[PDB]
Amino acid sequence: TKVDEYGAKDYRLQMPLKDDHTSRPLWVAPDGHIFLEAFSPVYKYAQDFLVAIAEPVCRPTHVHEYKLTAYSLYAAVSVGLQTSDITEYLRKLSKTGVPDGIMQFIKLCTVSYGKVKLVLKHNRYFVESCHPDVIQHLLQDPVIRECRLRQTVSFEVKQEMIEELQKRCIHLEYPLLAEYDFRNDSVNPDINIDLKPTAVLRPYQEKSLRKMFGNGRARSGVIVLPCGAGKSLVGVTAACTVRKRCLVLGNSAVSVEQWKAQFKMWSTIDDSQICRFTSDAKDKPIGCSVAISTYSMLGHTTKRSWEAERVMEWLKTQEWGLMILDEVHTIPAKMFRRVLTIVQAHCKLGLTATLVREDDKIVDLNFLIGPKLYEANWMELQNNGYIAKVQCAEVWCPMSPEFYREYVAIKTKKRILLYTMNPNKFRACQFLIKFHERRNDKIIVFADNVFALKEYAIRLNKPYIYGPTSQGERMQILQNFKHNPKINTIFISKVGDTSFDLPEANVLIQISSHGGSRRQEAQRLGRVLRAKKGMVAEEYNAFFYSLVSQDTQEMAYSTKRQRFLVDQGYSFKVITKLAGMEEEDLAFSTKEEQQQLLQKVLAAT
Template sequence: MGPPKKFRKYDSKAGSDRSGKKKKVEEDVTIDLVEDDNGENAGVPGAAMQDAEKNDQVPEDEFGAKDYRSQMELKPDNTSRPLWVAPNGHIFLESFSPVYKHAHDFLIAIAEPVSRPQHIHEYKLTAYSLYAAVSVGLQTNDIVEYLQRLSKCAVPAGIIEFIQLCTLSYGKVKLVLKHNRYLVESKHVEVLQKLLKDPVIQQCRLRRDGDEELLASALPNKPTTALASKPGEEKPANGAVPEDISQFYQQLDKDDEEDETTDITAKNSAVAFEVDPDKIEVIQKRCIELEYPLLAEYDFRNDTINPDINIDLKPTAVLRPYQEKSLRKMFGNGRARSGVIVLPCGAGKSLVGVTAVCTVRKRALVLCNSGVSVEQWKQQFKCWSTADDSMICRFTSEAKDKPMGAGILITTYSMITHGQRRSWEAEQTMKWLQAQEWGVVVLDEVHTIPAKMFRRVLTIVHSHAKLGLTATLLREDDKIADLNFLIGPKLYEANWLELQAHGYIARVQCAEVWCPMMPEFYREYLVQKINKRMLLYVMNPSKFRACQFLVRYHERRGDKTIVFSDNVFALRHYAVKMNKPYIYGPTSQNERIQILQNFKFNPKVNTIFVSKVADTSFDLPEANVLIQISSHGGSRRQEAQRLGRILRAKKGALAEEYNAFFYTLVSQDTLEMAYSRKRQRFLVNQGYSYKVITELKGMDQEPDMFYGTREEQGMLLQQVLAASETDCEEEREGVAGSAGGAARRAGGSLASLAGADDALYLEHRRSYNKHPLFKKFRY
């Protein structure tokens, strides 16, 4: 991710001028940034328009890097200080500093991580990251003072001004649900009076008979049982730590403990006004535009309207330190804050979600993105909590349990947003679901929520608190910032390499295998259209042979291997040719479960082929090898999600040795190489490195390898050229678990019909002329 770009002041009259088509080169440059190119600024705080580097006019050195030596004078004891704060809002942290533990936890709360390799970490201050800092209890003065203490040089005045601008108004207004009434609450009377002068908010306000201008919002000072540090939890080392940093850090810890044991609003200290539940979304948008974003909190301990559910964690459920820390961010003040927790794949996001449900102890809704994930979440609840089958209800296309009496409902995004006709049973379940007040909604793979269809879930389901879980808080369409409004701020984000070093996730060797294009394939690649080109470099015989060799090599080692392909034509061809099971969109739920169970427990099934339906929520802890033969363009998120399929900690493996292997097979001199570079950016920023392999030793001596002769390669080329346009396309989203799909048109040509390119005769694809009487009988 490059340096932050200049934000432009929004002008509603000029919005249409910026809504034109983007150039292709611009997409490549701005892919990581939240831009304003489409003129849609609804729900964006004014502070987000401010530019942290407005005065960042500095000379460059001979290498083109910014030279701050003349502007940033080092402190005398700079060697004991761990970070630099640059005038452009970027912060650079020394991971080898004795104060690293202090600084890392602080920076995670106030800034967005940009790049975290082994020795130097880069963070970036943004309006939304500072909003998140205030939402977890940090004050403006604390942020500025601690940055001053940690920095090797004085914090630039422009950065201090930016922090004050972004934080002074945040956290002053809260949205609380009490006794089934939505209240906009604040300790600052003047703030609420200012909001009530806005005509949009006036329309959202709900008045009842006898209500005063502002309601008193009294809360008892009731001690909470929020998660606290265990005695054996690692504490920061004090050796070589400056005394001012150590004292200030202890003061912050003390403040956090006070927040955890005392409610944040003293009795009779807050005032509020009631709003219409149907206009919650409108008032949230408007308050953000007025730079008073509503902090969504749920006072679940004092909720006497919604019944408690009988659920607790089992004694065997032991939280890891980073899981406890993430949950303390959510429940630190005795209420449930809505927000997003980011943990690597395989790091125990499910246990975090189960613990959150057990803490709130109200009706819970869990939203997943596939039927397989629904089954896995049910098993996670039964594994870690006291919930049994009678408490858990599944609502999918193939499993519709009766919801009456259930306290936990697990379903998919597509089931909730389905707009077509439903069965009578599904319709009754939907009516029951919409009539409930859910205590907490757990949104698995929350990065899918900004999609136009899935974000409708939040208007259909009424909930008190929302917890988003994901490993990759990024999207290629720049809509990830919408989560700040749709769900809430980012509460916590873990460091991948730190978890790997402590053995919480597997130690992975990433490799990029270069496969030369065969001359005949490359000749056709240069003249074909884009879709056919993609199929040609995926079906490259060299890539097939490399995949076959790696599968055999790791099977001999006793490894469990997953092979990914976005292209279904290639997926079926590879799997059938190697005689391996495969899973893709139309595969039924029962068949998927049967294949996955065999992969987990059958020693004879060590390799499976899967399409993009397995990118997320497929829990396969036994897998330790992943081979990628086809992918979705330059998607960084997909690369990280696929790596997550093998990130589960391996039993009996040494932390110092590689115990998982991630191969990406790339056809040389094709567009696939450019895509591969883009895909790797997120993982490289997390500290991973890719090893380039140009030759697989031993492949030439491997017996019975396919496509070793020119004749076999020529026959494969003919099959690829004969493939229809539909075969050339990647699998589309939304077909998971369905046996059929919408009607589609098959591509072809007259030459194909005549057999000039050895294609199959395609006349059977055309509909026959039938008598009108028989058109009703379709099979």
């Protein structure tokens, strides 16, 4: 609240300093921001405690940055950490005390939890509460009455208005409890699903699963893990532990196929007990319990086929012990979020690897599913070797004179097609691909503009893939990339970042970017995180190049796009010039070729 002569806020008169400040490695700002030291001997204990009570926002190598909020404190209480149980240790760890503001915030957030519980039974959602005064003073506004369908006091609530009531309670200061007591539940018989000994659970996966199952009752929340970290394995383990009917929701055909494959591989459950509620192919969804389907199908708004209508009615009628949702970052979308209310589930677990978006709808996930239970430390995984170390780099390509002339001259938005296609970046990508091809490194080129992708691919006679590409040709190209030594590069379009199971690649070049999309950036980066059989963290075997054009909007987009990666800790090294480019022969070495490319770009319209 107090501002120094500079931008930073003043806290000299706010909180004191502990005498043993050197011993205490923890800081506590009044706003809730906490700065932990990664060099302290008690760093591991401090990391565990701060991860338990707060969500990371920036975890560089030296000083980690966390911030705590109501959702994080509710998650702490869910895993069973009381207000004293957290605040006493926070004061002990803190080297400068705990401000009264944070003290009162923690007290209020902890006490305002568990008073209101939401439990669904016999397809009816009852808002139970041991304390009656909570309901007595919660029925002040008329929205609750119009919502409600027309000790331990409970009342039934309308299915459709659950989301509205929950978001209302979040700001009403009475969060709802979504804990599932699968251990004590006789209404829905347990499913015959077990985890085979073959599956191996990594320490971070076990920690995330523990945070989810803080107690005997499963907690509904979101667990963010890298795509290569085995989030599918974590979800399968969660379903197996729940031992009740599980509905997994993918985002595409590839996602549902991969989910079924993961289920069969890691769970002893028989093949016949798993169904694919997919329009392309179905396996009698009503027949078995464990189901894998898609947001599009479940939330489909237009006319429903007869068989799909029967399946949807069966799904609505039945109650699901677990609702797994992969790629939760798309949930807050209208149709996708409608699925949450369409289907009934005790706990809706969420898994993803890039929980970031521009529109401020990510905060809605906290109530749509639950608080962010776990968020894996990418740097720690890199050190442990679970994830391949990546030498993140941004190659700056000077824009050609003429191309810059038209780009600046035109105030329209042909620049997206223009700066994405310039001779300098073309030569840079050609030289980089040549260098990695002679180094036997697998290349996955990326480009949002299909026009630019096709031009580059024809000029380099490479197998570009894109949306309306035939499925058979797509599979053939992927198989050739994985097996045929003569080919070691594939030019994938935006379809690549959506969902796929691609072979591990040693390099990932990105000539063009869709925009300031942290989601796309992280999604494409996750492709090369696949750990090799015997690599090492310090070898930096994996490389990521994000080619950008100097003095163009692409620079702003790249800077706005690398925010999530830098927050994780990756250091994007800038490369102004590439050694050997002048000696190496590359296309567009004369003014004329650039001229024809510019003419084609202009005629593109």
